[PDB]
Structures are given as structure tokens and as C-alpha cells.
Enzyme design. Structure first.
Site, short mmCIF file in Angstrom:
data_model
loop_
_atom_site.label_atom_id
_atom_site.label_comp_id
_atom_site.label_asym_id
_atom_site.label_seq_id
_atom_site.Cartn_x
_atom_site.Cartn_y
_atom_site.Cartn_z
N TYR A 28 27.25 -24.67 -3.86
CA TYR A 28 26.11 -23.63 -4.11
C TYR A 28 24.84 -23.65 -3.06
O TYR A 28 24.58 -22.68 -2.39
CB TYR A 28 25.66 -23.78 -5.46
CG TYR A 28 26.43 -22.65 -6.36
CD1 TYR A 28 26.18 -21.54 -6.71
CD2 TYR A 28 27.72 -23.42 -6.95
CE1 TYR A 28 27.11 -20.74 -7.52
CE2 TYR A 28 28.54 -22.43 -7.72
CZ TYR A 28 28.05 -21.47 -8.15
OH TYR A 28 28.96 -20.62 -8.83
N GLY A 30 22.55 -23.67 -0.51
CA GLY A 30 22.57 -23.18 0.70
C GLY A 30 22.44 -21.70 0.63
O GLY A 30 21.41 -21.25 0.41
N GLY A 32 24.32 -17.84 -1.00
CA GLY A 32 25.23 -17.38 -1.89
C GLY A 32 26.00 -18.92 -2.86
O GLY A 32 25.23 -19.66 -2.97
N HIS A 48 20.46 -22.60 -10.71
CA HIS A 48 19.23 -21.86 -9.82
C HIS A 48 19.51 -20.65 -9.33
O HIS A 48 18.94 -19.44 -9.35
CB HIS A 48 18.65 -22.87 -8.82
CG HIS A 48 17.45 -22.29 -8.33
ND1 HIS A 48 17.49 -21.67 -6.98
CD2 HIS A 48 16.28 -22.46 -8.59
CE1 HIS A 48 16.20 -21.23 -6.61
NE2 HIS A 48 15.40 -22.02 -7.64
N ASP A 49 20.75 -20.33 -8.74
CA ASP A 49 21.30 -18.77 -8.23
C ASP A 49 21.30 -18.11 -9.65
O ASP A 49 20.91 -17.06 -9.52
CB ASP A 49 22.67 -18.98 -7.62
CG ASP A 49 22.74 -19.56 -6.05
OD1 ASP A 49 21.55 -20.53 -5.89
OD2 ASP A 49 23.86 -19.62 -5.56
N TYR A 52 17.86 -16.95 -10.38
CA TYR A 52 17.42 -16.06 -9.85
C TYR A 52 17.94 -14.64 -9.88
O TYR A 52 17.32 -13.57 -9.89
CB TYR A 52 17.71 -16.13 -8.14
CG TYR A 52 16.35 -17.25 -7.82
CD1 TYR A 52 15.74 -17.93 -8.59
CD2 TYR A 52 15.76 -17.04 -6.33
CE1 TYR A 52 14.52 -18.76 -8.10
CE2 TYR A 52 14.71 -17.64 -6.03
CZ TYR A 52 14.09 -18.53 -6.82
OH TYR A 52 13.03 -19.15 -6.42
N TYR A 73 3.68 -17.93 -6.67
CA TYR A 73 3.24 -18.10 -7.89
C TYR A 73 2.26 -19.33 -7.98
O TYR A 73 1.90 -19.71 -6.74
CB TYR A 73 4.41 -18.62 -8.98
CG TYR A 73 5.36 -19.51 -8.26
CD1 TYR A 73 5.09 -21.01 -8.20
CD2 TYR A 73 6.74 -19.35 -8.08
CE1 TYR A 73 5.91 -21.89 -7.76
CE2 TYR A 73 7.60 -20.28 -7.42
CZ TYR A 73 7.20 -21.67 -7.45
OH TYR A 73 8.11 -22.35 -6.71
N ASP A 99 12.47 -22.66 -10.36
CA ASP A 99 12.21 -23.63 -9.28
C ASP A 99 11.95 -24.89 -10.11
O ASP A 99 12.57 -26.15 -9.58
CB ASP A 99 11.07 -23.35 -8.26
CG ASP A 99 11.29 -21.91 -7.34
OD1 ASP A 99 10.42 -21.43 -6.71
OD2 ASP A 99 12.59 -21.61 -7.60
#
Ligand SMILES: [Ca+2]
Ligand SMILES: [Ca+2]
Length: 124
Positions: A28, A30, A32, A48-49, A52, A73, A99
């Protein structure tokens, strides 16, 4: 924003080079992702992907060039602990937490060298 995520990682794991350590790691980490993650670390990357993805789907958030990484932020770092500022807007806070959760998650996952620069075409 991206640079603040590298920096939260550096917060949670003080002796780390984020781009060197966690970029092109696993399925994952990197750009996509594909397949099932290879270990807990890669799983952190997958979550995390996803985090988002969810964010892009709040009707009230419209990110510059559609990329949550462009979104700054407010957060601070203290003795290893990341705090997202409460005064971030709802969109800024969502990203800030993705994050945040990914940095802590990274800091607890075992790091398996065999998985850095994986033949993704083959194992992902
Ligand atoms: Ca990814
Ligand atoms: Ca902002």
C-alpha cells in the site's frame, strides 16, 4: 498536508526517514495500493488510504486538486505524542486524524525489510 504527515511520523518514530522507510513498502505504502496488505505495517498504510477515501466523500470537503494531502491543518508534537488542534475545521480535523492514526499505527507495527520495495505485480 503531506509534509505534515512525514513530520508526525518523525514525531512518533524519532529515528526515522519517512520517505526512505515507509514509501514503496508493502502493497500500500507509496501510491494507490492493491490486493491484501502483507503485514500490520502495510495494513496501517491501507487504513490510511481508506481514511483518505472517506474524507474525499464528506460532501462538505472540497480539496485542492482533489487531494487531501494538500490540506494543511494544525497539530503539535510533544514527547512522542501527536495532538491535533481542536480548532481545525471538520475537514482539517479528519485529515489531521488519519495522519495521526497512521503515525501511531506505524510506530507500533513490526518493520520487515523483506517488504520494502515489494514486487507488487506478483504479491499484491
Ligand atoms: Ca497508498
Ligand atoms: Ca487548511
Amino acid at each position: 498536508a503531506l509534509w505534515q504527515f512525514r513530520s508526525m511520523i518523525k514525531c512518533a518514530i524519532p529515528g526515522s526517514h519517512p520517505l526512505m522507510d515507509f514509501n514503496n513498502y508493502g502493497c500500500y505504502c507509496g501510491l494507490g495500493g492493491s490486493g491484501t496488505p502483507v503485514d500490520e505495517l502495510d495494513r496501517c498504510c491501507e487504513t490510511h488510504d481508506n481514511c483518505y477515501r472517506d474524507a474525499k466523500n464528506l460532501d462538505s470537503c472540497k480539496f485542492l486538486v482533489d487531494n487531501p494531502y494538500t490540506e494543511s491543518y494544525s497539530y503539535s508534537c510533544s514527547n512522542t505524542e501527536i495532538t491535533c488542534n481542536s480548532k481545525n475545521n471538520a475537514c482539517e480535523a479528519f485529515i489531521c486524524n488519519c495522519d495521526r492514526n497512521a503515525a501511531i499505527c506505524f510506530s507500533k507495527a513490526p518493520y520487515n525489510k523483506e517488504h520494502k520495495n515489494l514486487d507488487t505485480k506478483k504479491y499484491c
